[PDB]
PDB file of C-alpha atoms in Angstrom:
ATOM      1  CA  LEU A 259      -4.836  31.654  19.649  1.00  0.00           C
ATOM      2  CA  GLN A 260      -1.658  33.484  18.992  1.00  0.00           C
ATOM      3  CA  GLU A 261      -0.127  35.133  22.040  1.00  0.00           C
ATOM      4  CA  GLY A 262       2.451  37.807  21.175  1.00  0.00           C
ATOM      5  CA  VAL A 263       5.505  36.749  23.181  1.00  0.00           C
ATOM      6  CA  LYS A 264       8.712  34.944  22.282  1.00  0.00           C
ATOM      7  CA  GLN A 265       7.395  31.516  23.168  1.00  0.00           C
ATOM      8  CA  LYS A 266      10.266  29.381  24.406  1.00  0.00           C
ATOM      9  CA  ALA A 267      10.140  25.580  24.541  1.00  0.00           C
ATOM     10  CA  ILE A 268      12.531  22.621  24.601  1.00  0.00           C
ATOM     11  CA  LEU A 269      13.045  21.231  21.087  1.00  0.00           C
ATOM     12  CA  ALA A 270      14.854  17.920  21.621  1.00  0.00           C
ATOM     13  CA  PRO A 271      16.258  16.476  18.348  1.00  0.00           C
ATOM     14  CA  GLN A 272      14.816  13.127  17.269  1.00  0.00           C
ATOM     15  CA  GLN A 273      18.384  11.857  16.989  1.00  0.00           C
ATOM     16  CA  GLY A 274      18.069  11.281  20.730  1.00  0.00           C
ATOM     17  CA  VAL A 275      14.553   9.911  21.265  1.00  0.00           C
ATOM     18  CA  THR A 276      12.623   6.678  20.603  1.00  0.00           C
ATOM     19  CA  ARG A 277       8.975   5.607  20.302  1.00  0.00           C
ATOM     20  CA  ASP A 278       8.246   2.226  21.909  1.00  0.00           C
ATOM     21  CA  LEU A 279       4.921   0.512  21.205  1.00  0.00           C
ATOM     22  CA  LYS A 280       4.801   2.930  18.253  1.00  0.00           C
ATOM     23  CA  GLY A 281       3.700   5.848  20.411  1.00  0.00           C
ATOM     24  CA  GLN A 282       5.193   6.190  23.900  1.00  0.00           C
ATOM     25  CA  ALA A 283       8.171   8.569  23.939  1.00  0.00           C
ATOM     26  CA  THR A 284      11.211   7.604  26.020  1.00  0.00           C
ATOM     27  CA  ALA A 285      14.599   9.330  26.291  1.00  0.00           C
ATOM     28  CA  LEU A 286      17.961   8.765  27.993  1.00  0.00           C
ATOM     29  CA  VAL A 287      19.711  11.631  29.799  1.00  0.00           C
ATOM     30  CA  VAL A 288      22.594  11.925  32.281  1.00  0.00           C
ATOM     31  CA  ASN A 289      21.793  13.292  35.749  1.00  0.00           C
ATOM     32  CA  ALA A 290      24.052  15.487  37.887  1.00  0.00           C
ATOM     33  CA  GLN A 291      25.432  12.296  39.437  1.00  0.00           C
ATOM     34  CA  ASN A 292      26.980  11.620  36.013  1.00  0.00           C
ATOM     35  CA  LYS A 293      24.607   8.647  35.894  1.00  0.00           C
ATOM     36  CA  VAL A 294      22.091   7.940  33.118  1.00  0.00           C
ATOM     37  CA  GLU A 295      18.373   8.025  33.966  1.00  0.00           C
ATOM     38  CA  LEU A 296      15.187   7.075  32.110  1.00  0.00           C
ATOM     39  CA  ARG A 297      12.490   9.752  31.856  1.00  0.00           C
ATOM     40  CA  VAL A 298       9.356   9.628  29.700  1.00  0.00           C
ATOM     41  CA  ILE A 299       8.802  12.731  27.552  1.00  0.00           C
ATOM     42  CA  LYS A 300       5.632  14.094  25.927  1.00  0.00           C
ATOM     43  CA  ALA A 301       6.828  15.253  22.495  1.00  0.00           C
ATOM     44  CA  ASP A 302       4.036  15.450  19.909  1.00  0.00           C
ATOM     45  CA  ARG A 303       4.972  17.892  17.131  1.00  0.00           C
ATOM     46  CA  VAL A 304       7.942  17.733  14.751  1.00  0.00           C
ATOM     47  CA  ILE A 305       9.819  20.919  13.818  1.00  0.00           C
ATOM     48  CA  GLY A 306      12.646  20.497  11.310  1.00  0.00           C
ATOM     49  CA  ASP A 307      14.547  17.579  12.835  1.00  0.00           C
ATOM     50  CA  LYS A 308      13.737  18.216  16.502  1.00  0.00           C
ATOM     51  CA  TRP A 309      10.656  17.332  18.591  1.00  0.00           C
ATOM     52  CA  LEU A 310       8.667  19.797  20.713  1.00  0.00           C
ATOM     53  CA  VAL A 311       8.695  18.189  24.164  1.00  0.00           C
ATOM     54  CA  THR A 312       5.612  19.518  25.977  1.00  0.00           C
ATOM     55  CA  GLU A 313       6.471  17.792  29.258  1.00  0.00           C
ATOM     56  CA  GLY A 314       9.465  15.567  29.928  1.00  0.00           C
ATOM     57  CA  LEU A 315      12.611  17.671  29.550  1.00  0.00           C
ATOM     58  CA  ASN A 316      13.198  21.101  31.099  1.00  0.00           C
ATOM     59  CA  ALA A 317      15.806  23.729  30.208  1.00  0.00           C
ATOM     60  CA  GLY A 318      19.367  22.622  30.915  1.00  0.00           C
ATOM     61  CA  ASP A 319      19.005  18.836  30.783  1.00  0.00           C
ATOM     62  CA  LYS A 320      21.586  16.858  28.793  1.00  0.00           C
ATOM     63  CA  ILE A 321      20.204  14.624  26.029  1.00  0.00           C
ATOM     64  CA  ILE A 322      22.293  11.581  25.070  1.00  0.00           C
ATOM     65  CA  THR A 323      22.499  11.393  21.266  1.00  0.00           C
ATOM     66  CA  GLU A 324      25.708   9.551  20.354  1.00  0.00           C
ATOM     67  CA  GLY A 325      26.027   6.680  22.816  1.00  0.00           C
ATOM     68  CA  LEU A 326      22.660   4.927  22.927  1.00  0.00           C
ATOM     69  CA  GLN A 327      23.825   2.365  20.362  1.00  0.00           C
ATOM     70  CA  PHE A 328      24.890   0.308  23.390  1.00  0.00           C
ATOM     71  CA  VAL A 329      23.999   1.363  26.937  1.00  0.00           C
ATOM     72  CA  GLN A 330      21.566   0.958  29.841  1.00  0.00           C
ATOM     73  CA  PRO A 331      19.854   3.038  32.584  1.00  0.00           C
ATOM     74  CA  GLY A 332      21.845   3.109  35.820  1.00  0.00           C
ATOM     75  CA  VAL A 333      25.426   3.595  34.627  1.00  0.00           C
ATOM     76  CA  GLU A 334      27.828   6.556  34.577  1.00  0.00           C
ATOM     77  CA  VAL A 335      29.629   8.078  31.589  1.00  0.00           C
ATOM     78  CA  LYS A 336      31.586  11.019  30.152  1.00  0.00           C
ATOM     79  CA  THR A 337      30.026  14.151  28.637  1.00  0.00           C
ATOM     80  CA  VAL A 338      31.505  14.986  25.224  1.00  0.00           C
ATOM     81  CA  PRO A 339      29.576  17.626  23.192  1.00  0.00           C
TER      82      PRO A 339
ATOM     83  CA  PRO B  13      21.937  -3.115  14.887  1.00  0.00           C
ATOM     84  CA  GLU B  14      19.499  -4.748  12.461  1.00  0.00           C
ATOM     85  CA  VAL B  15      15.824  -4.300  11.549  1.00  0.00           C
ATOM     86  CA  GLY B  16      13.136  -5.842   9.350  1.00  0.00           C
ATOM     87  CA  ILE B  17      12.545  -3.415   6.485  1.00  0.00           C
ATOM     88  CA  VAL B  18      10.038  -3.804   3.644  1.00  0.00           C
ATOM     89  CA  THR B  19      10.588  -2.500   0.109  1.00  0.00           C
ATOM     90  CA  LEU B  20       7.831  -0.005  -0.706  1.00  0.00           C
ATOM     91  CA  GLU B  21       6.549  -0.340  -4.282  1.00  0.00           C
ATOM     92  CA  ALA B  22       3.857   1.413  -6.330  1.00  0.00           C
ATOM     93  CA  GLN B  23       0.627  -0.606  -6.520  1.00  0.00           C
ATOM     94  CA  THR B  24      -2.651  -0.016  -8.376  1.00  0.00           C
ATOM     95  CA  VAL B  25      -5.499   0.244  -5.840  1.00  0.00           C
ATOM     96  CA  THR B  26      -9.162   1.295  -5.957  1.00  0.00           C
ATOM     97  CA  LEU B  27     -10.733   3.801  -3.546  1.00  0.00           C
ATOM     98  CA  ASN B  28     -14.165   2.645  -2.327  1.00  0.00           C
ATOM     99  CA  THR B  29     -15.993   3.421   0.938  1.00  0.00           C
ATOM    100  CA  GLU B  30     -18.937   1.634   2.598  1.00  0.00           C
ATOM    101  CA  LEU B  31     -21.496   3.727   4.474  1.00  0.00           C
ATOM    102  CA  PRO B  32     -23.802   1.680   6.751  1.00  0.00           C
ATOM    103  CA  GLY B  33     -27.421   2.753   7.127  1.00  0.00           C
ATOM    104  CA  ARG B  34     -31.081   1.838   7.432  1.00  0.00           C
ATOM    105  CA  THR B  35     -33.810   2.132   4.833  1.00  0.00           C
ATOM    106  CA  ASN B  36     -36.705   4.497   5.510  1.00  0.00           C
ATOM    107  CA  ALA B  37     -39.959   5.509   3.918  1.00  0.00           C
ATOM    108  CA  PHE B  38     -39.662   8.389   1.483  1.00  0.00           C
ATOM    109  CA  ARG B  39     -42.761  10.060   2.942  1.00  0.00           C
ATOM    110  CA  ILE B  40     -45.182   9.009   5.710  1.00  0.00           C
ATOM    111  CA  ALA B  41     -48.763   9.932   6.569  1.00  0.00           C
ATOM    112  CA  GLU B  42     -51.378   8.906   9.129  1.00  0.00           C
ATOM    113  CA  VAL B  43     -55.078   8.276   8.464  1.00  0.00           C
ATOM    114  CA  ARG B  44     -57.427   9.710  11.107  1.00  0.00           C
ATOM    115  CA  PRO B  45     -61.089  10.524  11.631  1.00  0.00           C
ATOM    116  CA  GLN B  46     -62.342  14.076  11.912  1.00  0.00           C
ATOM    117  CA  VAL B  47     -65.976  13.415  12.755  1.00  0.00           C
ATOM    118  CA  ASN B  48     -67.495  10.920  15.143  1.00  0.00           C
ATOM    119  CA  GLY B  49     -69.174   7.813  13.830  1.00  0.00           C
ATOM    120  CA  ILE B  50     -69.224   4.165  12.869  1.00  0.00           C
ATOM    121  CA  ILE B  51     -67.051   2.676  10.165  1.00  0.00           C
ATOM    122  CA  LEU B  52     -69.334   1.361   7.420  1.00  0.00           C
TER     123      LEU B  52
ATOM    124  CA  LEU C 259     -19.088   5.101  -2.659  1.00  0.00           C
ATOM    125  CA  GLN C 260     -16.636   5.105  -5.563  1.00  0.00           C
ATOM    126  CA  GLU C 261     -13.786   7.465  -4.662  1.00  0.00           C
ATOM    127  CA  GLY C 262     -11.913   6.938  -7.933  1.00  0.00           C
ATOM    128  CA  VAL C 263      -8.841   4.834  -8.716  1.00  0.00           C
ATOM    129  CA  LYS C 264      -5.292   5.804  -7.736  1.00  0.00           C
ATOM    130  CA  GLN C 265      -2.727   5.385 -10.536  1.00  0.00           C
ATOM    131  CA  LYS C 266       0.069   4.038  -8.327  1.00  0.00           C
ATOM    132  CA  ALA C 267       0.708   4.841  -4.663  1.00  0.00           C
ATOM    133  CA  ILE C 268       2.515   3.423  -1.641  1.00  0.00           C
ATOM    134  CA  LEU C 269       0.631   1.233   0.835  1.00  0.00           C
ATOM    135  CA  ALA C 270       2.770   1.219   3.991  1.00  0.00           C
ATOM    136  CA  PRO C 271       1.641  -1.435   6.536  1.00  0.00           C
ATOM    137  CA  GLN C 272       0.395  -0.189   9.922  1.00  0.00           C
ATOM    138  CA  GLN C 273       2.871  -2.581  11.527  1.00  0.00           C
ATOM    139  CA  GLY C 274       5.443   0.095  10.705  1.00  0.00           C
ATOM    140  CA  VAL C 275       3.681   3.398  11.402  1.00  0.00           C
ATOM    141  CA  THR C 276       2.657   5.363  14.509  1.00  0.00           C
ATOM    142  CA  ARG C 277       0.237   8.188  15.345  1.00  0.00           C
ATOM    143  CA  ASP C 278       1.606  10.644  17.917  1.00  0.00           C
ATOM    144  CA  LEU C 279      -0.768  13.181  19.499  1.00  0.00           C
ATOM    145  CA  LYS C 280      -3.415  10.738  18.266  1.00  0.00           C
ATOM    146  CA  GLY C 281      -3.191  12.078  14.730  1.00  0.00           C
ATOM    147  CA  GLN C 282       0.207  13.016  13.280  1.00  0.00           C
ATOM    148  CA  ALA C 283       1.693  10.131  11.283  1.00  0.00           C
ATOM    149  CA  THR C 284       5.415   9.422  11.638  1.00  0.00           C
ATOM    150  CA  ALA C 285       7.492   6.592  10.153  1.00  0.00           C
ATOM    151  CA  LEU C 286      11.066   5.281  10.367  1.00  0.00           C
ATOM    152  CA  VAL C 287      12.958   4.329   7.190  1.00  0.00           C
ATOM    153  CA  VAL C 288      16.574   3.585   6.226  1.00  0.00           C
ATOM    154  CA  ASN C 289      18.194   5.722   3.506  1.00  0.00           C
ATOM    155  CA  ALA C 290      20.723   4.655   0.862  1.00  0.00           C
ATOM    156  CA  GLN C 291      23.474   5.534   3.340  1.00  0.00           C
ATOM    157  CA  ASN C 292      22.227   2.569   5.406  1.00  0.00           C
ATOM    158  CA  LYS C 293      21.220   5.211   7.966  1.00  0.00           C
ATOM    159  CA  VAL C 294      17.749   5.620   9.488  1.00  0.00           C
ATOM    160  CA  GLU C 295      15.766   8.840   9.050  1.00  0.00           C
ATOM    161  CA  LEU C 296      12.497  10.309  10.364  1.00  0.00           C
ATOM    162  CA  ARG C 297       9.986  11.416   7.728  1.00  0.00           C
ATOM    163  CA  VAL C 298       6.414  12.537   8.429  1.00  0.00           C
ATOM    164  CA  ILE C 299       3.857  10.723   6.267  1.00  0.00           C
ATOM    165  CA  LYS C 300       0.295  11.714   5.369  1.00  0.00           C
ATOM    166  CA  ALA C 301      -1.595   8.410   5.504  1.00  0.00           C
ATOM    167  CA  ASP C 302      -5.351   8.814   5.974  1.00  0.00           C
ATOM    168  CA  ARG C 303      -7.171   5.747   4.584  1.00  0.00           C
ATOM    169  CA  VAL C 304      -6.781   2.115   5.705  1.00  0.00           C
ATOM    170  CA  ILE C 305      -6.719  -0.762   3.197  1.00  0.00           C
ATOM    171  CA  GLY C 306      -6.585  -4.265   4.650  1.00  0.00           C
ATOM    172  CA  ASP C 307      -3.670  -3.942   7.066  1.00  0.00           C
ATOM    173  CA  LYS C 308      -1.744  -1.227   5.213  1.00  0.00           C
ATOM    174  CA  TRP C 309      -2.153   2.564   5.107  1.00  0.00           C
ATOM    175  CA  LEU C 310      -2.359   4.600   1.890  1.00  0.00           C
ATOM    176  CA  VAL C 311       0.379   7.210   2.343  1.00  0.00           C
ATOM    177  CA  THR C 312      -0.612  10.238   0.252  1.00  0.00           C
ATOM    178  CA  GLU C 313       2.639  12.105   0.919  1.00  0.00           C
ATOM    179  CA  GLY C 314       5.537  10.963   3.088  1.00  0.00           C
ATOM    180  CA  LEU C 315       7.104   7.896   1.479  1.00  0.00           C
ATOM    181  CA  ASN C 316       7.962   7.509  -2.218  1.00  0.00           C
ATOM    182  CA  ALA C 317       8.418   4.347  -4.293  1.00  0.00           C
ATOM    183  CA  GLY C 318      11.438   2.321  -3.215  1.00  0.00           C
ATOM    184  CA  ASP C 319      11.924   3.468   0.385  1.00  0.00           C
ATOM    185  CA  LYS C 320      12.486   0.803   3.045  1.00  0.00           C
ATOM    186  CA  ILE C 321      10.071   0.820   5.986  1.00  0.00           C
ATOM    187  CA  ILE C 322      11.329  -0.589   9.294  1.00  0.00           C
ATOM    188  CA  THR C 323       8.692  -2.966  10.676  1.00  0.00           C
ATOM    189  CA  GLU C 324      10.441  -5.524  12.897  1.00  0.00           C
ATOM    190  CA  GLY C 325      13.070  -3.617  14.862  1.00  0.00           C
ATOM    191  CA  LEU C 326      11.516  -0.318  15.936  1.00  0.00           C
ATOM    192  CA  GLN C 327      11.016  -1.912  19.359  1.00  0.00           C
ATOM    193  CA  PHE C 328      14.364  -0.316  20.246  1.00  0.00           C
ATOM    194  CA  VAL C 329      16.132   2.149  17.938  1.00  0.00           C
ATOM    195  CA  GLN C 330      16.663   5.818  17.044  1.00  0.00           C
ATOM    196  CA  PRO C 331      17.078   8.089  13.966  1.00  0.00           C
ATOM    197  CA  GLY C 332      20.579   8.950  12.782  1.00  0.00           C
ATOM    198  CA  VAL C 333      22.052   5.463  13.184  1.00  0.00           C
ATOM    199  CA  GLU C 334      22.938   2.722  10.688  1.00  0.00           C
ATOM    200  CA  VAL C 335      21.651  -0.863  10.613  1.00  0.00           C
ATOM    201  CA  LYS C 336      21.237  -4.098   8.648  1.00  0.00           C
ATOM    202  CA  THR C 337      18.431  -4.890   6.199  1.00  0.00           C
ATOM    203  CA  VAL C 338      16.786  -8.258   6.901  1.00  0.00           C
ATOM    204  CA  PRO C 339      13.464  -8.846   5.047  1.00  0.00           C
TER     205      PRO C 339
END
């Protein structure tokens, strides 16, 4: 069914997400405490180059793209767009 | 960062599917009496 | 049932493919620029241990099998058979 309203949803780019066990979606974001956390997202579709996260990342969150090449959950870092 | 990639190459394969099933009579009928009596 | 013979197609092993949303097929390959990308494949059948990709991966592409346990698209890597 097509509901007539600008449907808004978080479209997190795949350049910042991984699929362990060839399925489970896990991402790395930085909390308000400038520390990196580990939250599991529920992205299923694939639009363009981003992934439609149904439940895992709300509006505002900061997704770490360039910096996962060497990191770990529980450390602090700098935020450079 | 390193991974174990495999070179994809065109192969010649055949498409065949196996459908499991049981055999059954084409048509079935029962033989019954319609009068009372003794079988001669 | 004889479903005809395919001229020449790609048979990407399941050990390098995933099915998100329990359906959509997504794979991870490394381009000529030694960088990994995210292309959506259309593999339906299952031959042996590989999947017949109808549309998603052409002849030549490199499919990442041993290493997806921890990675992400948009990064470069080494090619070890």
